[PDB]
């Protein structure tokens, strides 16, 4: 009957959050009752969802998290459910959805440390019964290295791109309306950098590449970054590069598909990225992609011939050259667009929720 | 009841893939249930096919393949079948369809990748192995025997399995006329086609060089169309360097290959290596003259049919340049090569592979 889903924060403009929502909605469509435990819920609550916001707090995140697990534990003791699915690492999970990378590995590069390490071990320890849903093949060996987790407990899932990201029948109309709204002409080249966490996702690298463009391309090129981050540190870089009139940083928003159809390139030179849903959202929108090979979903871009993947180790000069080459070549971008849409029509990019629900429900 | 077919990748525009599909459909028509294990399946699943896509990935291709094997065996242990047919070399096959050349030979022409692929090849071809081998390239059989000592009686040479739609139709002249009209080819234009994904291996680099080297008269008349799923950029760079921007197109994969075969004037295929080369025979049965390197397993058909020219090893670009020029300049010879191909296609056994394969698979 009842499934309990646990995540620290729900809000619409995050990958973890969207993945949880799509899994919960799939489970509900199979006739299961949906209960959710969280510290905060922003936006609409779907019909039938029982969302419980925990009345606990602490100025220390780790202490807050401890109070949260105690609260959920107590509620579950009184109000039992059939299965418990967590999207953050903690004790008492039947299933864990591995949105995050391995903490212990990242640590090797103490109250807070012992909290996050312990909560990771609560999932991955060989004595834990938690089943792990993986979305990255890269991180599975790292969990095993640190914890010795049994192989049988890992289940690799494909992507779970939503259908509203696919280019619609009226894609030309949507693009035209967007470009009108933003005052873009046919010779303007709009780069989009999408996702909260601009530092990690390489906005600094993107700005440098834009600034380094040859004169003719530099005049034509604009960038919009979309994320919840404080823009203030980046405005300093923008001013020093002389890009005040060519860069905008927008807050999170729901109409990402418009931007994917209206833009000319998605740029994503992340320092690290477990997967990178926006990479595939661009692909299924027919938006060419420039991405670093460190991203877990970068391989799809190469495999689909839907953009360019920058090889490691990162060189800013190499990014600069590649951006210029992609922007200069309108035929190539037209081909990358066609190739993405073709790939999107046969590739297994959408089935994560069905695969996850099958494993969750048995 | 149930037959298990195993191939790492299914997609429409490949020889291995097309051969697999033809055999599977034939076996189904004889009343068998079809199960397929793969890492990726592009396209519709035929009615009645049980297609299992293994949820396994790795940073190393060869390690992924190892996980795939274990995944398949685990399923077979719980859901057994009558016979297991593989189109890639691996342990646990009752029957292997030799869609690949001898790996050990190429390796000689540790390293984790080498050990994996050598081990999987040995799993099939070792004298102690029970796997029955369906051969499509006779040229490769002595190399497997040299390297592994595989018993002669475990090899079964299949004929080609060219599909009916590649044979020149009654309205061939009209199809050609329409194609050339569409692409804007006049009677004095010469179209080369290079067909098949894997352009580097199949020698598109050599083809473009040969085109560029043509005498001025021929060069100006000659066009090339390449058709495959490859990233075109490395070839577009070469095309620009050779000054052939106005004379070459590189197209993505497509299903209407027959009209290109009928519309073209030569198929060029100077491959570095090629186990067989389906497109060579497709050209032949379309009456399209062929220029091919002798390394291709099906090159001997071109010579036997007298339906083109085979460039002998070792490869020298100058000799390809010369041969292309000689073939393009001689319109009577090309007319003869076309007639010879069509004639050969009317008597040779180029079509029956799937029925032969099913016979051997099902006993
Ligand atoms: O204003 C915005 C910004 C983003 N999004 C959407 O949010 C998702 C972002 O996903 P992704 O590109 O994967 O970014 P992250 O959410 O930062 O994902 C990283 O971080 C997660 C952990 O929080 C991991 O699960 C992922 O594997 C890892 O790539 C996409 O659907 C975007 O369309 C919006 O709808 N609106
Ligand atoms: O765009 C394409 C490219 C190839 N093919 C077919 O794919 C097969 C390629 O087989 P071949 O043995 O020539 O090449 P391989 O797949 O072994 O590299 C032939 O039947 C081609 O007609 C096709 O239908 N469309």
Author numbering:
A (entry chain B): 1 to 109, 118 to 370
B (entry chain A): 1 to 109, 117 to 370
Which sentences from the paper describe this structure?
The glycosyltransferase WaaG in Pseudomonas aeruginosa (PaWaaG) is involved in the synthesis of the core region of lipopolysaccharides. The PaWaaG monomer displays a typical GT-B fold, consisting of two “Rossmann-like” β/α/β domains.
In order to gain insights into substrate binding in PaWaaG we solved structures of the enzyme in complex with the nucleotide sugars UDP-glucose, UDP-galactose, and UDP-GalNAc in space group P21 to resolutions of 1.95, 2.02, and 2.20 Å, respectively. Inspection of the substrate-binding site shows that the UDP component of the nucleotide sugars superimposes well with UMP from the PaWaaG-UMP structure, as exemplified with PaWaaG-UDP-glucose. Interestingly, structural comparisons show that, while the galactose portion of PaWaaG-UDP-galactose superimposes perfectly with the galactose component of GalNAc from PaWaaG-UDP-GalNAc, it occupies a quite different position to the glucose moiety of PaWaaG-UDP-glucose. In PaWaaG the glucose group is twisted significantly relative to 2F-glucose in EcWaaG, and is supported by hydrogen bonding with the sidechains of Glu281, Asn282, and Thr283. Solution state NMR experiments revealed that PaWaaG specifically hydrolyzes UDP-GalNAc and that the enzyme binds UDP-glucose but does not hydrolyze it. This indicates that our UDP-GalNAc structure represents productive substrate binding and confirms that the PaWaaG-UDP-glucose structure shows a nonproductive substrate binding mode.
